[PDB]
Symmetry: D2
Subunit: 221 residues, 4 copies
């Protein structure tokens, strides 16, 4: 199945997306920092999600959090998460070039009550996440997002940021994907409420031109 | 002071509120379920807040001592709070209640099932989402930790408590959360039956949070009990 | 049909609404001042809408003829609309009113000063922001032009009419405007005393807009008159 | 006074703005498409606004709308609206390079009832506008804005856009300036309600890198 992934996605995307539909998602992505690809808005065909899930549960059995270099050992994940077809398509949503170049990958695995990935920003512009396994909404695990913010590393003022803004909450079901503007959207996961609530996330980090400019200047400018 | 309290409050409110300001607050209360009375919007003069804080501190210390002397987050129950003449006077003031009814835009009935008229909570160590059974909560944030330590109030207005399926997390997925920072001495009025609300957990021991909570009914709550 | 109307409406509502759906609409009505009953949320069956549209068309044509025969945007006044048995039956239906009171979460009183119980407007040529004096407007968008021609409803909830200084444009600067597209046959319920609202101007001759407007009171409107 | 404008603005901005304040305005600009520089948030000292006003009323006396090449004849307006100090400062708000390069300038002048500049988008990323004269709010003339939208030139669907979004309204007083993200914020002016309501606007259009890329590709990509 390898190397044919490109044609498989180019066909799937071309059949399911008009340019106008992509521009509506671009509007939503700019407004909210967040686009969810659920069963009503698939971006990757179901067979490849089951495959990526299979690869992730295998890497989880040798962890919980799986660090980037371990995740990078999967050839399927590298092929999908760097597919020029997928990156070009998603740049219609970001309305800017995506640069798939560090901590490139990560697999979170939550299970015990109060499991959380607390409020934070990331140093890169984009997060492309696969919610391979998600507990029911009542068990927690939703993503929460505060767009149009920024990380002041000398005084992040997370709680004062919440007082100035409204929090969006996104429920996820197993197999959902989502794109996040991870540098200006403060985000977190909702703590798990039960033990035995399995939450497995593949996180993929990409850059924009602004992230290359920050590297070249060593400065937020 | 006794009936001097009502005279003090009437003069303070008359000196500080225009009809237009009251209507602006009423618009905010309908829109958000929440109105904060802070240093830029006092409703009770600062001298009375200090006195109410002293009374709440006394009740908390006495409650803690009595508990220690019997049993070996503290919560002062309604009947114990009610014994404070000062707290009873300010929180049942005809002047304050009538003023606030201009913001609720409906009658406030200072009657609730006795066990939940009043409450004082005092939190000293790091330690959820709900609705109440009555329309109004009038809360005195007598002592608040830094915003950075937590303790904010969060609110989701225009919701409802389905007692058979509360669906808190599904409600969060459909709505946006508002967060309100408080500092010591702030008061707030909350539409507690249609605003899903919680206290933000404190994330640091030694952050002290002392709240006086007062529950009031509206006409809908009387009817609900009757049917 | 006569009392067959109430039986038809009861069965239609019972078949199409769960308690959870009604509470969701009540949450939306409190939050936005507005609930649209469109093809995905019918409240009156389509056959009755067609019949009400035919009656409104008749009243408009008869009104226009009578005016032409005396004098040489048409507006059918309340007393003339009231003569339609069909329109009177559907708009005063105990079944419909009781159902909608689940969305308002308060009693609906189908009484208003007689001159403004009912209204039919009919607009045929290209041609403002206000509040009403009563809590509820139940509107039948019987004929609507394309959205591109205008005719939407815009709304700013959680406001109030200061009759001495309405300050429409200053209100707009403080709030966000909601816009609702309508197609022929849509109905909507509006909290007309706290939602500043307008019809979007039609920007094309030959775009036809026919509306049946019904005003209802809440308990606050009875009290307001009495005081 | 000419040529000293740079130092005059560099001093004024450095005394009145911390980097943190600029980043809060950046957050607001991304969220809303709109930052207002009123008496509480001046960007240009009062003496230069009175001067620019003086120049604009003169150009208005020989118009109403004053086209770009006529406006360009004013040396003061060119100096201020291309000041490297101002452009560099404002790029802290846009969080991207501003390119002051076509219809570079425009002076609208409204006066009779129902005067309006109807709903539209612009072809450039930024509008830097000077509300030199504004009637009272009750006479109209406010700016209205719908951010996170886009101009589909084959079917702009303005009214359907309003049905999907909320409208922001910004009141302006004489001397207010504002920065607008003019390509993704649908915008208009509120029609004047009285005759003799004088509304004089200087509009300055700037590009971003995305606008140069659209030129080079002839395409929205």
């Amino acid at each position: 199945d390898v190397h044919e992934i490109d044609e498989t996605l180019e066909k799937f995307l071309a059949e399911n997306y008009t340019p106008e539909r992509v521009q509506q998602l671009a509007d939503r992505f700019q407004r909210t920092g967040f686009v969810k690809f659920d069963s009503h808005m698939r971006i990757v065909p179901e067979e490849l999600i089951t495959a990526v899930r299979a690869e992730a549960d295998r890497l989880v059995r040798e962890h919980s959090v799986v660090k980037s270099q371990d995740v990078e050992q999967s050839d399927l994940i590298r092929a999908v998460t760097r597919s020029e077809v997928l990156l070009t398509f998603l740049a219609g949503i970001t309305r800017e070039r995506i640069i798939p170049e560090d901590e490139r990958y990560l697999i979170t695995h939550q299970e015990f009550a109060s499991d959380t990935h607390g409020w934070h920003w990331d140093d890169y512009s984009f997060a492309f996440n696969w919610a391979l396994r998600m507990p029911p909404i009542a068990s927690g695990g939703m993503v929460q997002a505060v767009p149009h913010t920024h990380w002041d590393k000398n005084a992040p003022r997370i709680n004062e940021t919440l007082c100035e803004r409204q929090i969006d909450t996104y429920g996820l079901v197993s197999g959902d994907l989502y794109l996040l503007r991870s540098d200006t959207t403060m985000h977190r996961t909702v703590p798990l409420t039960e033990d035995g609530a399995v939450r497995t996330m593949l996180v993929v980090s990409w850059s924009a031109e602004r992230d290359l400019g920050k590297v070249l200047t060593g400065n937020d400018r």
